[PDB]
Design a protein around this ligand. Structure first.
Ligand SMILES: [Mg+2]
Lengths: 145, 49, 112, 48, 116, 102
RNA sequence: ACCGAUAGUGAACAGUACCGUGAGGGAAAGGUGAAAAGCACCCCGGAAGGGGAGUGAAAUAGAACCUGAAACCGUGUGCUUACAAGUAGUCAGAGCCCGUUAAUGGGUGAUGGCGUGCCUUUUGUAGAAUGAACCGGCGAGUUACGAUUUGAUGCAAGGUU
RNA sequence: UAACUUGGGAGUCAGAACAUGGGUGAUAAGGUCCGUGUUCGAAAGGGAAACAGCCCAGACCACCAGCUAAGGUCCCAAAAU
RNA sequence: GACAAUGGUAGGAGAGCGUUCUAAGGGCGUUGAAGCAUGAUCGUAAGGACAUGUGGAGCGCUUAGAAGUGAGAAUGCCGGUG
């Protein structure tokens, strides 16, 4: 007897959250956020529809590293031109454009499908303590760890 | 017996094997001959003795 | 109602006829006659004669008013091919296909 | 030099997307006669 | 007497053609490629009737895990406790309950907690 | 209202007046069957089976002993000359739940 | 208990087209209808072709004439597609459109999982090893006479011509 | 729970990697020649990213049931942040 | 009924499906045979029906017999078409 609930687009209700990346470790914040961008923390989780919530990371210039990672955590970016390999350390990438640091770390934990691409478009990283989306009325989340 | 109800004695008749007629018979492609050599050729046996 | 006309075994290739025939599909008859007089492909006069024949059938056999008629369908089918040869270098021959076409036009007034 | 694979129906028909001809200019001969090609003269079959 | 091939070849080939309805391009038109594709699809169907049973069990466990974290348990300990309590409900039923009836699932969780 | 029964080699969640399909049973059309393995009763008063609820039957009427849609089982090995093909229709029985006796 | 138009003669209409200086080699090509009753006359068109009218049981039987498959070429539409990386399917699955040899129906497919054609030959082939453009027809353990072994049947110290 | 004897019918005589006892080579080779096991050949399924020969295991057919092996439990990706 | 077995290449053994023809029996057909086309049908497989359209004169079924008895591959042969 086949009786398993599947979610539709007329079933799903996505809500908004705010994470504070202040005094947190990159990666350890990123995996917990990645699990929320997908509906993994929900019953009614269905794998062929998008059933996750929106996230906002606010401070994101206060993120932390543990080792000597800030001087040798190069990133490496090729450009498809002969000898066109480029480079930047993790330390200088959070000094300039800290938003691309966290965004890229979280998107690397999502599947590379047509649905993973759409799920990663709910991220909204900012540097500093304020964000524009007051009209969506987001709550705080308080990472589990 | 009637001429429309003939039956042979049980065990007396039998159908002949036809070789080289598809894979499910068990005697399809190579027809029971194995692979290459003198014995797989047409008229290929060696002399008795 | 509908009136049709066919021209069978025209000695132009169908790929060349269809190219002009895609210009008049779904237009009223007067505009289609105008278009066929100003296009300068080889198949314009032949298609024009087929269209004229259909318009005359629509009026003599079915008593339709030719002032309000549209070209409902226009298409070209393949006919039988004539097979020929051309001598090439070093004693070799190559094939040549002289292709033909069947051309059909049907006009209607849009009512019943 | 020679094609490695044959060309399917769908690829052949995609290539012929732009292979078409367009409708001509076609202004109308006002005083007398039917349509003519624009900027042209039709001494017969047209007053213009 | 002579037996000419007649009408058996066409009928046999047309069955396989009809089994390839909906395939792309010449894979629904020509006998040779159609036959190859129908063979491959029979092999795929055999293999997938057995992967279905792994996929759905994997989905139920995800849903139960999500439902148990809302009562401060993980799937691991919840199943351990339910076994020590003697409860024998499927993973498939345990996740339909958690979806439709939240109070019943809460009562299951309390018994699983008391058996530890 | 809500009951979990165990039939065949599996478990089903049922309610009053619902149709279900199970592995073949030994009954005739029109008869009445009684499921006596009940693991959980929900709704207003929740009763959780030890595994079993100790009482708690569910009664149902039988409709249509039948056999399912035709499956074709086909497999083959690549360059060996080996394949086989066979069909299968799985039998089932259909019932309508008429009373949940908690 | 021979063939039935790729068969049977090479040849159902030919030692002819055609090829070769010559000796010589050597094809393809059957079927309107019971009866020609084989489309008077009108219309568009230089004609060819066509639309009506008529003959006929039937003209999508009109001489390229019984039936009329597939490859291949078009016209019209129900569902779908312009941020996407593919052996083209398969399993899961919304939405939209329909309604059958009536049964836990049919068409399409947003999105997710898994997934390197077939044959031959090899220790081992997705193989950058071989073969096939596609569709149709044709195309490979047979028969005679001996030998041996097994099953069946008749008679039996005999059996058989 | 096999073995042997008599008769009918075969195919095979290009083998490969891994572990271990040895020759040859240079205590070289995905080398080559023997002894002893296993797997491939002729074996799908799970693991080793992918990966005939390594580790776990031998597919009669249904199922949207359950327990385990090797290997695993932050996210990709099932299970201990 | 209890118990057990059921991956497989060279290869051995068994049981069957379908095609053309013959014999005997029993049938169908201008109120429409064979062939062809479509369908959501039946059987463990090879395969068998039924309904509708086209077609216009032949064809199944049962038991037995006899074979030019089954094609996807041969840089296969012939024709047609890309
Ligand atoms: Mg086309």
């Amino acid at each position: 007897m086949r009786q398993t609930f599947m979610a539709n687009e007329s079933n799903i209700e996505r809500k908004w959250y705010v994470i504070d990346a202040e005094g947190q470790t990159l990666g350890r914040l990123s995996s917990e956020v990645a699990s929320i961008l997908r509906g993994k923390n929900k019953v009614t989780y269905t794998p062929h529809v998008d059933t996750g919530d929106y996230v906002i990371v606010i401070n994101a210039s206060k993120i932390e590293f543990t080792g000597n990672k800030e001087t040798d955590k190069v990133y490496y970016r090729h450009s498809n031109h002969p000898g066109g390999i480029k480079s930047i350390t993790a330390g200088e990438l959070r000094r300039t454009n800290p938003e691309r640091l966290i965004e890229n770390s979280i998107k690397g934990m999502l599947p590379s499908t047509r649905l993973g691409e759409k799920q990663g478009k709910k991220l909204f990283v900012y540097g500093g303590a304020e964000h524009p989306h007051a009209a969506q009325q987001p709550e705080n989340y308080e990472l589990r760890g | 017996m009637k001429l429309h109800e003939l039956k042979p004695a049980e065990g007396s008749r039998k159908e002949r094997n036809r070789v080289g007629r598809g894979v499910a018979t068990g005697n399809g492609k190579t027809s029971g001959r194995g692979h290459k050599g003198q014995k797989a050729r047409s008229g290929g046996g060696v002399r008795p003795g | 109602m509908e009136a049709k006309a066919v021209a069978r075994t025209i000695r132009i290739a169908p790929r060349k006829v269809r190219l002009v025939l895609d210009l008049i599909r779904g237009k009223n008859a007067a505009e289609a006659i105008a278009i066929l007089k100003l296009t300068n492909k080889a198949s314009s006069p032949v298609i024009e004669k087929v269209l004229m024949s259909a318009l005359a059938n629509a009026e003599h056999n079915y008593d339709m008013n030719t002032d309000e008629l549209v070209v409902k369908e226009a298409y070209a089918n393949e006919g039988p091919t004539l097979k020929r040869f051309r001598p090439r270098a070093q004693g070799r021959a190559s094939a040549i296909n002289k292709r033909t076409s069947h051309i059909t036009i049907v006009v209607s007034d849009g009512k019943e | 030099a020679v094609p490695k694979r044959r060309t399917s129906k769908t690829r052949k028909n995609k290539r012929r997307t732009h292979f078409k001809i367009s409708v001509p200019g076609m202004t109308e001969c006002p005083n007398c006669g039917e349509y003519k090609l624009s900027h042209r003269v039709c001494k017969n079959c047209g007053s213009y | 007497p002579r037996v000419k091939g007649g009408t058996v070849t066409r009928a046999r080939r047309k069955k396989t053609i009809k089994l390839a309805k909906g395939y792309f391009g010449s894979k629904h038109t020509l006998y040779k490629v159609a036959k190859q594709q129908v063979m491959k699809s029979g092999q795929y169907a055999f293999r997938d009737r057995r992967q279905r049973k792994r996929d759905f069990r994997k989905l139920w466990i995800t849903r139960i895990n999500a439902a148990a974290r809302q009562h401060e348990m993980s799937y691991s300990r919840l199943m351990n406790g339910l076994k020590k309590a003697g409860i024998d409900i499927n993973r498939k039923m345990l996740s339909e309950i958690a979806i439709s009836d939240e109070k019943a699932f809460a009562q299951l969780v309390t018994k699983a907690k008391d058996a530890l | 209202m809500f009951a979990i029964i165990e039939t065949g080699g599996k478990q089903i969640k049922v309610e009053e007046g619902q149709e279900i399909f199970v592995e073949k049973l030994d009954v005739n059309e029109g008869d009445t069957f009684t499921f006596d393995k009940v693991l959980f009763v929900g709704g207003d008063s929740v009763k959780v089976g030890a595994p079993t609820v100790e009482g708690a039957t569910v009664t149902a009427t039988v409709n249509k002993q039948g056999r399912g849609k035709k499956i074709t089982v086909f497999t083959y090995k690549r360059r060996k000359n080996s394949k086989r093909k066979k069909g299968h229709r799985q039998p089932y029985t259909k019932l309508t739940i008429d009373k949940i006796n908690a």
